[PDB]
Amino acid sequence: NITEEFYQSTCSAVSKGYLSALRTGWYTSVITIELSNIKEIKCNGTDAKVKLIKQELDKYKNAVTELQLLMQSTPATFLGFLLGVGSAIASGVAVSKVLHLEGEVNKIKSALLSTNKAVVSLSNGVSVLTSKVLDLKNYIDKQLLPIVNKQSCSIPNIETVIEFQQKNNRLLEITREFSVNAGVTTPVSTYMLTNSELLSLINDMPITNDQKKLMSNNVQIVRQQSYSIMSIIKEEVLAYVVQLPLYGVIDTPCWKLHTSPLCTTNTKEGSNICLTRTDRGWYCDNAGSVSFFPQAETCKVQSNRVFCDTMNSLTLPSEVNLCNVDIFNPKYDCKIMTSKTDVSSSVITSLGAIVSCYGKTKCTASNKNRGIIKTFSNGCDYVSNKGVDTVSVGNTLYYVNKQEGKSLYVKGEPIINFYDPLVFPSDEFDASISQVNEKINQSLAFI
Amino acid sequence: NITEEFYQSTCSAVSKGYLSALRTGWYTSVITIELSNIKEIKCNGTDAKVKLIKQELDKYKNAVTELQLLMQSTPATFLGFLLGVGSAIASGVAVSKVLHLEGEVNKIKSALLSTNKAVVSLSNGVSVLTSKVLDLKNYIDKQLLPIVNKQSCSIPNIETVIEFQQKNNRLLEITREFSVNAGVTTPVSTYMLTNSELLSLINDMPITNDQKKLMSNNVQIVRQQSYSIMSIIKEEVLAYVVQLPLYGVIDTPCWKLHTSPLCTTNTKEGSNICLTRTDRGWYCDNAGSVSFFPQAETCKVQSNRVFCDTMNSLTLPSEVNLCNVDIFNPKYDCKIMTSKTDVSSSVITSLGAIVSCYGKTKCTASNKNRGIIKTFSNGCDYVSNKGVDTVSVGNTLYYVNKQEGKSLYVKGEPIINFYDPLVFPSDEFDASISQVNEKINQSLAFI
Amino acid sequence: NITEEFYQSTCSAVSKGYLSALRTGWYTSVITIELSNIKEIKCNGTDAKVKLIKQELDKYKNAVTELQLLMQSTPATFLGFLLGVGSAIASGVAVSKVLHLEGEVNKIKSALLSTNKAVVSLSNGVSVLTSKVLDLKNYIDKQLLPIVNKQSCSIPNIETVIEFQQKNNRLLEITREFSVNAGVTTPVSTYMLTNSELLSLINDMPITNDQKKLMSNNVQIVRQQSYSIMSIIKEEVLAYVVQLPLYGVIDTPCWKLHTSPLCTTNTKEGSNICLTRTDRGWYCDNAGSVSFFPQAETCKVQSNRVFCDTMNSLTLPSEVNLCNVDIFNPKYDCKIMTSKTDVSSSVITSLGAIVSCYGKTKCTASNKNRGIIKTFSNGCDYVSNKGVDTVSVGNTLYYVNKQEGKSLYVKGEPIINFYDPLVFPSDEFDASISQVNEKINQSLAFI
Amino acid sequence: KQLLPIVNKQSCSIPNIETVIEFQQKNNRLLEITREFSVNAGVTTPVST
Ligand SMILES: [Cl-]
Ligand SMILES: [Cl-]
Ligand SMILES: [Cl-]
Ligand SMILES: [Cl-]
Ligand SMILES: [Cl-]
Ligand SMILES: [Cl-]
Ligand SMILES: [Cl-]
Ligand SMILES: [Cl-]
Ligand SMILES: [Cl-]
Ligand SMILES: [Cl-]
Ligand SMILES: [Cl-]
Ligand SMILES: [Cl-]
Ligand SMILES: [Cl-]
């Protein structure tokens, strides 16, 4: 169950009750389409059905030529600025490089001779699940060869014409996608891997039962965190690498920290000072530490499960959580920014709304059946989503999340009142409680 | 008519003459597709036309299964950093939640029994326009039932095979979109809602005539500001919620503020100081105040109409406009940032170009038929788009907008000259005229 | 060959050996589809093949009506914040404006009467390559006119029904794309311009042989840097402007600068100070200066060729490169930011990994066949990709690029040790070596 | 040359509709000749077309 606490003292709110699903590594799979080698198409037939087959075959050939151009290129793609820099498809591309080595394709080819799904050991030693999802070589050779391997074509039935267009379409769409994404696509579409194929791939994957269940019940999220990397087209084989998320952390507690500016509320226009907790984002317990995702928009929430990517995280000591109940705690130096910009806004939380209302701004909360039920005064305040449908701050209407769950309003003195505006450092974008303190003392020592 | 004024004193320019179209709220509509309940497909027929029908029916069934997986998940998605945080589909999702309640679908179902368009009152009390855009239940039951509700299939004509593929295609594409977007799409495609259906929906909407006209003449913009939210598939009904923008503010004056760095131009390399107005973006008059959109890229301009979203705005007193004619005005504390980074660049405006030219940079403006017609000297300067096609600053060529309209060059002393570099605070990212002043005095008091 | 150097003194690394391909200008081409003027469709025939033709014709007519709505709207779309602001399709839109002038379409129309590819001089004087990619007027008039210009329809063969759907599909997809992108698309899809058409357009373009070769071997990148702009649909002609990149700078040296925070490593928690080189990004030699791209994600790397856009660059003196071998050099004031935020992270480079390891973070580098082979101690360090497959910093696993190439570890004293923490200005987001120095002296003078 | 592929193999390659019609046209003459011989005990007069 989702619960939420608002801290009046620091103009912030924490939503608890979420369970983690963190992408920690990558699985790489090789997806293959078996192609037919087609040179000239031998026919003088002006028959309309032969003509449609020949047009479809030209589309097929142009698709192959197009992909051949692509395989000749190396495929590539508050506190967010503190993040490191990864190379998201380095793992997929490494596998893709191996597929260009001599006889490497042959391994794949003979392995998928009897079945359409096999585990192949590549030359470098990595084992990859390999899958043949479409056999155009077989279709073309068994249904289309008679109609154009001979000058006097045996005219195909209308149903064959339609069927070939259906089969070839997937090749055209895959090529279509690779062509406007420079050989790397994300999310992985159902053309790259159908829902059936993906579920089957997940089920045949060397992963825990929890991971299989998690991935199977959230394939749409799996798709969004996956890449499809165009690799090789040679020796009647199209191969692309699909890079799937590995979720090495599952079902640990996660919570979302929401923060909003906290300013003094003097009537004197520019005499006010402001403070904002900068450590907003997603937090998940992880291996004795806390995975912190400063850009909460990089996580996807499904019911009460949070899908995040560790590439977009910092690893913090778990004491970082103490900033929520006691921003002045001695065990962790809580991060804040400062300013004199007392502009009004709202932060819509999981179960309510934080409202930073300053100056002459009209700030209210409304129910759909009654209109305004609360008018906010200046300062930072909060309303739960129970009985509330919208919040308005100035000319901005916000709808609140109608998710069920309890909110707790933790009363406390706004900590901004504890500071003397004459020595308050109001130009900090990346500071903390202690940095502001020692800076204040350096101003007082000068006095 | 669009007009534009350049203020030499502050290295900024305002483009006037625009009319507002601000998204202020949301309308939620329920779009339905009537589905056929198909279990086993009874036929031993190896007939090629029966085979194509059976393949199309499998695609249909897999689509339904796919969407069933999706409906089991809760759908979710300079001065920009001052903005609040909304929940963009909270309204749509709230309606989507109601559709999961018992007998709620039945209301929709019986309401659309006689017509394909109706207004339904949901259990919570909200009235939503409901629309049936495709009846696959009817097609399958009346055209396809005989061919597979019996072991000995009555073989369908070739035209039926083609027609079914045409009809079923929309279901497949809708599913396709939802599958790579985790059940929430934006913009709303013509698969979700055809141009005809959307116009019809707009026309049947409970909105003013001005709003209907505005939305109808700009449906492509409406699409981009809309969401489609996958909701339920049960009891032979596919339902998704389409969340349409409500434009509560129309035809008020808007203007675009462009700003560029203003630096001193001493020959001594690092002895220069810089100032940039930070309040660039779109401004629209709105309800006695001004809606300010700091990220001008969040607004879409169509001719002289500006489409913005209030979620990406601050609400400011109208005195903010005074900063354009008098940055030192006593009624509003104009926002600026400071630095010593005198790098060269250009800002292409609505009707010209601002050029910040410093150091050894070559800065020119050219006509296509003649080449260089103006060479800029160091400092901040401006050229109108009349007679000018391009501007070059260093190795960067900019094309100017060829929109028709008059520009006015307001001469004035660059305000950066009024500051003493020895006490100039050059580390402010979020300051103002008054903050820089009082900071300067605190440095002078120490002296 | 790609090589790489790590500077221990400044926690940064430069990857060399790349060749430039910088977009410097734009080429504008007019792409045309010849349309048929179809009013009423005259038939009482309930024949299933006539019915499918009539359904396809309605789709055709709705497409035309849809595009007519679109042509009635004016189409529009660390150190990154230092960049100027361009108008990316100003050139394309200017050409698009000309196409709305009287008789301008007629010029295009008669020019493409004998061939499907011609160079037309527009009224304003600009010469544009013009291309007819699809003739629906001819198909409809020669194949479909008999079946519905007469009440008693001559029933078309099944192959014609299929063929028309194939031909019309491209019109529907083009319209589809324009409809969800407000008349401006990027990348340019194969529906807008097939691979064959694009290559042909490139080959007929008034550009050097090097440019043709470069564009032809990298069409997928060309597509991504191109725009398609919906222009006019009148007098049986659909015309859209395709805006292609001109690469005015080719095969000049480029290098990628990677930077990571450098902090002191005292055991006393908040007693540490940090420094980060802010000038990371791509650098290319360009016309006697250096084109600097602060957002390295705006450049696309294909093997050892870097595709960048000068619109996202600053033009710097070539002395900026001196910051790599000597950050205290007297010829260029090297840019840095400061803080006390000693958080751990890694930067994956072209040929290795920079590791900023501070506090209690576990930082290691591993091989796939052996596990941990290096454990990092606190400070900033580096490992080459030779023999290394992954790096871990806290809970974040990074795969390293497996690109071949030599790395050089340049030993040096971390420059952060040269600063006294008691007077170290740790609040600079946009400073430099000299700015930090003079600021330190102003603190010492107060002492 | 036209009918062998469709039935010398268990999995028939399905013939186009035009072939079906054409074969009926060609075979018809054989059927009519047989028809005539069958009601005339192998001797016909006049000799038909
Ligand atoms: Cl979130
Ligand atoms: Cl909202
Ligand atoms: Cl709920
Ligand atoms: Cl201070
Ligand atoms: Cl804009
Ligand atoms: Cl440009
Ligand atoms: Cl104009
Ligand atoms: Cl100062
Ligand atoms: Cl890069
Ligand atoms: Cl990675
Ligand atoms: Cl390599
Ligand atoms: Cl200081
Ligand atoms: Cl047939």
Residue numbers in the entry:
A (entry chain A), B (entry chain A), C (entry chain A): 27 to 103, 110 to 479
D (entry chain A): 174 to 222
Publication passage describing the model:
The RSV fusion glycoprotein (RSV F) is an attractive vaccine antigen, since it is the principal target of RSV neutralizing antibodies in human sera. RSV F fuses the viral and host cell membranes by irreversible protein refolding from the labile prefusion conformation to the stable postfusion conformation. Like other class I fusion proteins, the inactive precursor, RSV F0, requires cleavage during intracellular maturation by a furin-like protease. RSV F contains two furin sites, which leads to three polypeptides: F2, p27 and F1, with the latter containing a hydrophobic fusion peptide at its N terminus.
Structures of SC-TM (N67I, S215P and E487Q) and the processed variant with the optimized apex PR-DM (N67I, S215P) were determined to 2.4 and 2.3 Å, respectively. The structures of SC-TM and PR-DM were very similar to each other, with a root-mean-square deviation of 0.40 Å for 445 Cα atoms. In the processed version of RSV F in which the fusion peptide is not fixed, the additive stabilizing effects of the individual mutations at 67 and 215 were substantial. The N67I substitution had the strongest effect on both the expression level and stability but fully stable prefusion F protein was obtained only when the 67 and 215 substitutions were combined, resulting in a 20-fold expression level increase. In both structures the loop between α4 and α5, which includes Pro215, is well ordered with the proline side chain pointing down towards the interface of the triple helix formed by α1, α4 and α5, and into a hydrophobic pocket formed by residues Val76, Ile79, Ile206 and Thr219. The conformation of this region, however, could be influenced by an adjacent trimer in the crystal lattice, which packs head-to-head about the two-fold crystallographic axis. The electron density for Ile67 is weaker than that observed for Pro215, due in part to the intrinsic flexibility of this solvent-exposed, unstructured region of the F2 subunit. Nevertheless, the side chain of Ile67 points towards the interface of α1 and α4, and packs against residues Leu83 and Val207. The two regions that differed the most from the DS-Cav1 structure included the loop in F2 containing the N67I substitution and the loop in F1 between α4 and α5 containing the S215P substitution. Thus, the N67I and S215P substitutions preserved the overall conformation of the prefusion state and only introduced small, local differences in two loops.
